[PDB]
């Protein structure tokens, strides 16, 4: 449960939005990058792992799984790097539905921000605070706290 | 006090490291920026508040306290923006000691990274996982979970 995350990469406005989803809670972090490279992916994972107790990351595609730079960050940060094969086919629909939710939010805030990166961070904020009633941000803290105790 | 954070701005290699400290745990997030501007500060705060339940931020200086862009982000993200006057003189000492610790860690990793941004993220990671015993990353999750319950 508490340490498992899934990467996800989606596109908008000719840019790349890289997302990490905490699988058990639905909580996310995200960033905008000009292109998905192993270097950008590795730096994103190093950031994530300094902030939450990341035990395992299921990579978003085979290029990030293969990337020696990504493996070198997973080594550095103590992360088990795994593939993202949807052995549970539900995973695939959950990611697609998150991407559509995020893009919807982004369009709802898009005119309040000059830069796509601001709009994506507003979308992260709304996503993580939304009550569905607990929010994803409340669920991730409860799950990890429960595990620490 | 679960939602109280303090901003902190330190310099290294002619660049600026902006830090947010969670006061009750000592957990931190940080980024490297070319210069501290209201726009960079505001974006950093929007990021922090989408990730943790930020109720109040004590700003690191009067220019960020004054900055309308910074106040616009605190409004957007639901944050109470406050000054960082050390009414408790112990505050000054704690931040000064954290900056010295971070810089020490950055020097210990500095040659594993081409870019300062990497070294700073490695320093965030070591700082937050350090057991003093619980780690800052454990303490923040325990404090907020206790508050949610």
């Amino acid at each position: 449960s508490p340490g498992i995350w899934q990467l996800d990469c989606t596109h908008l406005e000719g840019k790349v939005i890289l997302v990490a989803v905490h699988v058990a809670s639905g909580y996310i972090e995200a960033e905008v990058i000009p292109a998905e490279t192993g270097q950008e992916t590795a730096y994103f994972l190093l950031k994530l792992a300094g902030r939450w107790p990341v035990k395992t990351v299921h990579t978003d595609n085979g290029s990030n799984f293969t990337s020696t730079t990504v493996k070198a960050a997973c080594w550095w940060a103590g992360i088990k790097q795994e593939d993202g094969i949807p052995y549970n086919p539900q995973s695939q629909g959950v990611i697609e539905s998150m991407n559509k939710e995020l893009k919807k939010i982004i369009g709802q805030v898009r005119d309040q921000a000059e830069h796509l990166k601001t709009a994506v961070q507003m979308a992260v904020f709304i996503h993580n605070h939304k009550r569905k009633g607990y929010s994803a941000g409340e669920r991730i803290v409860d799950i990890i706290a429960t595990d620490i105790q | 006090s679960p939602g109280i954070w303090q901003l902190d701005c330190t310099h290294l290699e002619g660049k600026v490291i902006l830090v947010a400290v969670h006061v009750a745990s000592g957990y931190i997030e940080a980024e490297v920026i070319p210069a501290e501007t209201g726009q960079e500060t505001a974006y950093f705060l929007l990021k922090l508040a989408g990730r943790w339940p930020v109720k109040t931020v004590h700003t690191d200086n009067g220019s960020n306290f004054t900055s309308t862009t910074v106040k616009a982000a605190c409004w957007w993200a639901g944050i109470k923006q406050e000054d960082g006057i050390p009414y408790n003189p112990q505050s000054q000492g704690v931040i000064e000691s954290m900056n010295k610790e971070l810089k020490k860690i950055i020097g210990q990793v500095r040659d594993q990274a081409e870019h300062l941004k990497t070294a700073v993220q490695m320093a965030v990671f070591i700082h937050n996982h350090k057991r003093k015993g619980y780690s800052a990353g454990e303490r923040i999750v325990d404090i907020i979970a206790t508050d949610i319950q």
Partner: peptide, 8 residues
Amino acid sequence: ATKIDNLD
């Protein structure tokens, strides 16, 4: 470059 963030 023999660095974690630049293996070259």
